[PDB]
């Protein structure tokens, strides 16, 4: 019940605010909190008292609060900012709890810009013998961390079937995903050919199979 | 200074109930504060209570209540979170956290590493290896993709290796997908020289330790 931006997008050694507003049973009357939540990590403490750093936290994070609005800053922004901000504070009414924002997901812009590799499978021999049919498109080495999968049987859209994974950050630090298209071995087969169209920062890369 | 340990992940279904524990290593909780707070997939951060063992004191959301118990054991310096009537919803990872003193209202400045509970109704089953093979549609600039699709199993999680672990670089395994049918799948190239394909001997290791199913598979043109 605390309010911040869902997303905000930066660069390498630029500044960046985020800003989280409550009320006055909540923020208006209680110290304002800020936890740092990097990808697959708990949440750490980043400010607290509105504007107090705890040990080992650098001074490029700053908090401040007036009113029943409280704001965090980071300058010098670095790669490794990249995280989930969360503010949290007290709300004093008589059922009393703690009360978070929904979180700023602080994307930091600082790689190079990567195409995504596509590699399509087809069903394999033993899966049809097993009566089924998975295509399988792997999608890595792409960077900033979005894409959007289509599919397709011949010329047209499928989309019963379809699981897509969320990107998940690799080693070198760019990004994978996965899709995935269920079939029956009659519908692999009945068609002339099923397609993966992967779209990156607007652009299209496709790769097709086809029944033996 | 103090870590904060929590017990293994979870796996539950629909109507059963969870008790996750948080024990106060190499230090206390005697003079604090302590909450718990969970986190959907993809989702924000949800306070579900929280206990104060010197005041004799619990505090819970409303959205929780009735269905959250929080404890604490002093003995063993170990506070407990049991929620009960679980949904596949109630899937999330849930975090213990120490307050900087005695009040709720105070800063949460220790945090411990989350346990992951996972609701469903599906139950426990190994995979289905299938050999991903590689060809000309996989092979470009002299290297070819080839990889295991690991299908159908529940639950999280699988690990894979290939040659034993022999065989490191160029391996790539994906994050898992969840079907409708309620059972992940997921899969593991490697990208090799196209030249050695003739000679070189190809296998993934997939290991299931929730169904104890171990599966070698050799991938072949």
């Known amino acids: 019940v605390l309010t911040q931006p869902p997303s905000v997008s930066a660069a390498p050694g630029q500044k960046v605010t985020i800003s989280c507003s409550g009320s006055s049973s909540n923020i208006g009357n209680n110290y304002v909190s800020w936890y740092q939540q990097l990808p697959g990590t708990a949440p750490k403490l980043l400010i607290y008292d509105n504007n107090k750093r705890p040990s080992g936290i650098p001074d490029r994070f700053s908090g401040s609060k007036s009113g029943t609005s409280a704001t965090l800053g980071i300058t010098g922004l670095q790669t490794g900012d990249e995280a989930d901000y969360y503010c949290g504070t007290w709300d004093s009414s008589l059922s009393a709890y703690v009360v978070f924002g929904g979180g700023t997901k602080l994307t930091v812009l600082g790689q190079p810009k990567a195409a995504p590799s596509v590699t399509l499978f087809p069903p394999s021999s033993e899966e049809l013998q097993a009566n089924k049919a998975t295509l399988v498109c792997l999608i890595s080495d792409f960077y900033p961390g979005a894409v959007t999968v289509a599919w397709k049987a011949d010329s047209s859209p499928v989309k019963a079937g379809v699981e897509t994974t969320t990107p998940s950050k690799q080693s070198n630090n760019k990004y994978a995903a996965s899709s995935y298209l269920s079939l029956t071995p009659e519908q692999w087969k009945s068609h002339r050919s099923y397609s993966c169209q992967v779209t990156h920062e607007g652009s299209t890369v496709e790769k097709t199979v086809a029944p033996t | 200074q103090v870590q904060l340990v929590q017990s293994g992940a979870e796996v539950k279904k629909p109507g059963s109930s969870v008790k996750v524990s948080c024990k106060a290593s190499?230090?206390?909780?005697?003079?604090?504060?302590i909450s718990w707070v969970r986190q959907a997939p993809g989702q924000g951060l949800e306070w579900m209570g929280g206990?104060?063992?010197?005041?004799?004191?619990?505090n819970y959301a409303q959205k929780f209540q009735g269905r959250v118990t929080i404890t604490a054991d002093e003995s063993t310096s170990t506070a407990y979170m049991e929620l009960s009537s679980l949904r596949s919803e109630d899937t999330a990872v849930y975090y213990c956290?120490?307050?900087?003193?005695?009040?709720?209202?105070?800063?949460?400045?220790?945090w411990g590493k989350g346990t992951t509970v996972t609701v469903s109704s599906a139950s426990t089953k190994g995979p289905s290896v299938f050999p991903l093979a590689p060809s000309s549609k996989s092979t470009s600039g002299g290297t070819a993709a080839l990889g295991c699709l690991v299908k159908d199993y529940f639950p999280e999680p699988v690990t894979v290796s290939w040659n034993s672990g022999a065989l490191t670089s160029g391996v790539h395994t994906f994050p898992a997908v969840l079907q409708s049918s309620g059972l992940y799948s997921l899969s593991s190239v490697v990208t090799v020289p196209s030249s050695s394909l003739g000679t070189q001997t190809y296998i993934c290791n997939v290991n299931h330790k929730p169904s104890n199913t171990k599966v070698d598979k050799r991938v072949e043109p």
């Open positions: 206990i104060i063992p010197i005041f004799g004191t619990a």
């Open positions: 956290a120490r307050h900087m003193g005695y009040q709720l209202r105070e800063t949460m400045d220790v």
């Open positions: 190499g230090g206390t909780f005697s003079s604090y504060a």
